[PDB]
């Protein structure tokens, strides 16, 4: 298993939350996602033969947010 | 047909905006509703028969906004 932090910015809200969390949630692989509002950090775990931490930021990126470089 | 202007506080995205939209659409009553997020404003038309000024407002906290 993985466990990634990844940075984020433009969240503004628990909705903002819900989106990212159901998004990244959904991809084949992932094992569990929280997300801190206040520092705009997207906490994942899972497993990487099945999912990439690119795979993770296209889907937050297709959110409307960015994920720092 | 009556109306009500609200200033509401802490919507932040267009998801706060359709939360506002939907919570209050659903509101038996109401005819129809514009939400301006920059300037945190709530117009709503309805028959005051059937909803209230309260009851918009109070949909609009249940959603966790502040109602002026
Ligand atoms: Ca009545
Ligand atoms: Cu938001
Ligand atoms: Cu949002
Ligand atoms: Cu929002
Ligand atoms: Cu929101």
Redesign the interface.
Known sequence: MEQKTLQVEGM??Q??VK?VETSVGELDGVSAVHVNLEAGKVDVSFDADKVSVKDIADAIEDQGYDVAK
């Open positions: 503004s809200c909705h903002c989106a």
